[PDB]
Amino acid sequence: DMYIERAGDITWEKDAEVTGNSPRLDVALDESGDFSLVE
Amino acid sequence: GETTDGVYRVMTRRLLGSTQVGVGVMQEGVFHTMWHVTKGAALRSGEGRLDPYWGDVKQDLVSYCGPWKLDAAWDGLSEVQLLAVPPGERAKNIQTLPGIFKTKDGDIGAVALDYPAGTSGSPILDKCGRVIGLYGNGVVIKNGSYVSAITQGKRE
Numbered sequence: 001d002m003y004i005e006r007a008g009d010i011t012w013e014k015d016a017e018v019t020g021n022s023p024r025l026d027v028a029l030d031e032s033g034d035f036s037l038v039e
Numbered sequence: 040g041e042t043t044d045g046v047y048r049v050m051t052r053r054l055l056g057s058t059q060v061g062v063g064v065m066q067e068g069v070f071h072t073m074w075h076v077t078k079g080a081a082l083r084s085g086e087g088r089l090d091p092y093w094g095d096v097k098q099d100l101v102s103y104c105g106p107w108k109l110d111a112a113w114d115g116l117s118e119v120q121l122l123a124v125p126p127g128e129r130a131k132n133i134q135t136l137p138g139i140f141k142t143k144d145g146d147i148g149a150v151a152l153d154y155p156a157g158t159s160g161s162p163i164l165d166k167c168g169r170v171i172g173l174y175g176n177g178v179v180i181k182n183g184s185y186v187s188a189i190t191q192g193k194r195e
């Protein structure tokens with residue numbers, strides 16, 4: 001039995017930590033909602 | 040129960056202690072999460088009950104109390120923010136420039152940020168604070184790193 005608990009407001013925060021790259025990938029999405037790499 | 044707009048943790052007491060299985064967004068009276076977080080089960084908010092209203096395993100999304108309300112889209116150029124809500128930790132915003140998932144049915148934005156499985160459902164936002172999608176359905180690439188799609192539903 002699942003329950004929900006508030007964690008915060010949804011707002012853009014100025015001067016947030018900036019990280020992560022931007023890869024361009026060929027992918028496939030199957031009927032089960034699973035993504036896979038196309039090679 | 041609490042129907043205030045915002046980001047929420049999805050918890051369960053079925054396992055050891057209280058475990059965070061995911062995250063969701065309450066907007067316009069509707070709770071939005073990823074399908075793999077709840078598997079379509081009913082939710083509790085204090086003393087109230089939230090029933091599933093719409094869901095789709097392939098899109099990996101589900102809405103409660105009403106139809107999917109989130110309609111903003113990534114502009115394809117700007118940085119975005121993942122409002123990550125990790126298990127046992129405070130909500131935090133991470134800014135990033137999304138990559139692209141290229142499919143036979145079109146291109147989707149993607150965020151190359153790795154967080155525990157229980158962070159699934161955390162919202163991805165634009166500079167106006169609008170939810171452009173949810174985090175947590177992705178792939179492991181050649182490097183071994185994790186990349187999530189920016190998953191957005193359709194507002195009827």
Ligand SMILES: Cn1cc(C(F)(F)F)nc1[C@H]1CCCNC1
Nearest residue numbers: 075153154155156159175176185
């Ligand atoms: C963020 N996330 C979501 C899920 C899944 F369970 F598949 F839904 N798995 C992850 C990450 C967890 C840390 C290692 N890399 C994958």
